[PDB]
Symmetry: D2
Subunit: 107 residues, 4 copies
C-alpha cells in the first residue's frame, strides 16, 4: 500500500473550499494575489523590523515564533491561490528553478 | 499489507538543503535575510504585471509570460522553505492552523 | 536688494532629525533597517487597494480612503528621508540625475 | 527678495513633462503606482540582501552608493507620480504624521 503525500495539493483543496463557499474567486486576479503576497511578506518582515544583529534575529524568532508561523502561512496561502489561477505546479516550479540554479552556481 | 508512505515535501526540502550546504550558504540564512529575500522575489513577481490596467489584461500577460511567473513563484517558495528550515516551522501545519482561524473570523 | 532663501526641505528634515534624536532612535537607523521600514510602509499603502478590480474602482477607493493613503505616503517618505540622512544622499539631486538617465533610455 | 524652494513641487514639473511627452499618464492608476513603489523599494533592499551586520551594511552603502542613490530616486519618482494622481501634498502629509507621532511617542 503506497501513500503519495502531496501536501500542497491537499492544502489547495482546503483553500478552494474556503474561497468558493464565500464567492471570493472573483477577487483572485493574478495581480491582486501577487499584491496579497507582497502584503503578507511585509507582515513577516515587520516582526524583525528593528533588529541589529543575526543574534537578535534568532531571539525575536524564538519569542515571536507564533507570529512568524502565521505570516509564513499567509504568504503560502496566497502563493497557492495564485498557483490555482495561473495553473502552475509550485513543486515542479521549485524543482526546475533549483536545476537551473545548479548549473548557474556549480560546485 | 505493508504501508509505504512517500514524503515528497521532505524530498523537495532535501534538494534545497543539499544546494545550500554544498555551497556553504547556511551562514547567510538568518531569519531577516530570508524574509528580505522573499520580499525581493515577490517584487520580481509583481513586476511582470506592473502596468496592467484590467483583470482581462492580467490574464493575457499571465498567459504570455507564464514562464517568468513560474520562476518567481519558485523563487518565493524556495526562500520561504529555507526560512521554514531555519525556524523549524512546518508550513503545511501553519496553513492548516491559519485556515482554521480564518474559518472562525469569516464564518459561513 | 538682499536675497533670502528658504530651505523648506531642510526644515522638514530638521523636524525628522529632532524626533529621532530626542528618542535616541538613531542607533536603530541602519541602512538595511530603514530599507526594511520603507518596504513595510509601501505594503501598508498597497493594502488600501488590495482587492480592487478596475482602475475605475481604485479612484473610488482612493477618494473614500484618502486619509489612509495620505498616512502611508507620509510613512514611506519619512523612512526614505531618514535613509537619505544616514547615507548622506540628496534625494532631489538623485531624482534629477535619474530623470536625466530616463531621458536617454526613453527618448522623445 | 524671497526665494521659497519647494523642491518636490519642482521635481514634479520635471516628472509631469516626462510622463506627458510620452503619454504614460494613462498607466498611472493608484494601484499601478503603489505597485511601482513596491518594486523599487525591493530594488533598494536587494543591494543589502545578504549582509550579516550593521557594520557590513555601512560598508555595502559606501561601495554601492550609486546603486542606493538610484533606487532612492526610483522610490521617490513613483511616490511623487502617486501624489500627483491622488492630489496629495507629500510634505504636508509628513508634517501631519510627525505631529501624530509626537503625541503617540511623547518625551
Ligand atoms: Cl512530506
Ligand atoms: Cl531645501
Ligand atoms: Mg498576515
Ligand atoms: Mg527571482
Ligand atoms: Mg504606516
Ligand atoms: Mg530601480
Ligand atoms: Na545559528
Ligand atoms: Na554608524
Amino acid at each position: 500500500i503506497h501513500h503519495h503525500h502531496h501536501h500542497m495539493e491537499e492544502l489547495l483543496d482546503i483553500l478552494r473550499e474556503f474561497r468558493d463557499s464565500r464567492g471570493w474567486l472573483k477577487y483572485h486576479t493574478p495581480k491582486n494575489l501577487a499584491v496579497s503576497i507582497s502584503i503578507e511578506v511585509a507582515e513577516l518582515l515587520e516582526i524583525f523590523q528593528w533588529t541589529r544583529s543575526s543574534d537578535e534575529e534568532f531571539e525575536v524568532l524564538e519569542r515571536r515564533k507564533g507570529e512568524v508561523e502565521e505570516e509564513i502561512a499567509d504568504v503560502l496561502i496566497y502563493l497557492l491561490f495564485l498557483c490555482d489561477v495561473a495553473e502552475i505546479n509550485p513543486i515542479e516550479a521549485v524543482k526546475r528553478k533549483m536545476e537551473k540554479n545548479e548549473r548557474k552556481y556549480p560546485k
